[PDB]
A and B are shown apart, each in its own frame.
Chain A
Amino acid sequence: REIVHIQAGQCGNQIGAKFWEVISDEHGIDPTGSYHGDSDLQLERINVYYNEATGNKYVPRAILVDLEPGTMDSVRSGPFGQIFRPDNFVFGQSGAGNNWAKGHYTEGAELVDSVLDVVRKESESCDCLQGFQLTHSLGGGTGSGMGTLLISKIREEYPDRIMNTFSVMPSPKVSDTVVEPYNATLSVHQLVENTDETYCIDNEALYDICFRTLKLTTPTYGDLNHLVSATMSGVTTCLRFPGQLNADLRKLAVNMVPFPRLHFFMPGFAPLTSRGSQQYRALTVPELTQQMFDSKNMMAACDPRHGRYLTVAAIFRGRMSMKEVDEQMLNVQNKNSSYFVEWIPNNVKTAVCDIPPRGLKMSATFIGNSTAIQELFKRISEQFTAMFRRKAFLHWYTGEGMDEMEFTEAESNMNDLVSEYQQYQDA
Chain B
Amino acid sequence: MEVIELNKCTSGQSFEVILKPPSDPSLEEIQKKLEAAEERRKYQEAELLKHLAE
A152 an interface residue at 8 Å Cβ cutoff? yes
The interface centre, meaning the residue of B45, B49, B52 with most chain A CB atoms within 10 A of its CB, is: B52
Report the nearest A residue to B53, measured CB to CB.
A156
B residues 19-54 touching A (CB-CB < 8 Å):
45, 48-49, 52
A21 CA to B17 CA, complexed, in Å: 73
Contact-residue size bin, chain B (C-beta under 8 Å from the other chain): under 10
CB-CB under 8 A from B52, the residues of chain A are 152, 155-156
A152 CA to B49 CA, complexed, in Å: 11
Report the nearest B residue to A155, measured CB to CB.
B52
| Chain A interface, >50% SS class | helix
Smallest distance from the beta carbon of A88 to chain B beta carbons, Å?
Answer: 25
CB-CB under 8 A from A159, the residues of chain B are 45, 48-49
A156 CA to B48 CA, complexed, in Å: 8
A211 CA to B15 CA, complexed, in Å: 79
A159 CA to B49 CA, complexed, in Å: 9
CB-CB under 8 A from A152, the residues of chain B are 52
Report the nearest A residue to B48, measured CB to CB.
A159
**Contact mask for chain A residues 136-164; partner B; CB cutoff 8 A; 1 contact, 0 none:** 00000000000000001001100100000
A152 CA to B52 CA, complexed, in Å: 8
A159 CA to B45 CA, complexed, in Å: 8
CB-CB under 8 A from A155, the residues of chain B are 48, 52
CB-CB under 8 A from B48, the residues of chain A are 155, 159
Smallest distance from the beta carbon of B30 to chain A beta carbons, Å?
Answer: 24
A424 CA to B28 CA, complexed, in Å: 43
Smallest distance from the beta carbon of A203 to chain B beta carbons, Å?
Answer: 31
Report the nearest B residue to A193, measured CB to CB.
B51
CB-CB under 8 A from B49, the residues of chain A are 156, 159
Smallest distance from the beta carbon of B40 to chain A beta carbons, Å?
Answer: 15
Smallest distance from the beta carbon of B43 to chain A beta carbons, Å?
Answer: 13
Lowest 4 CB-CB distances: which A-B pairs, in order? Answer: A156-B52, A159-B48, A159-B45, A152-B52
| Interface residues in chain A, defined as those with a beta carbon under 8 Å from any beta carbon in chain B | 152, 155-156, 159
Q: List 8 A-B contacts (CB under 8 A).
A: A152-B52, A155-B48, A155-B52, A156-B49, A156-B52, A159-B45, A159-B48, A159-B49
Known: A156-B52, A159-B45. 6 other contacts (CB 8 A): A152-B52, A155-B48, A155-B52, A156-B49, A159-B48, A159-B49
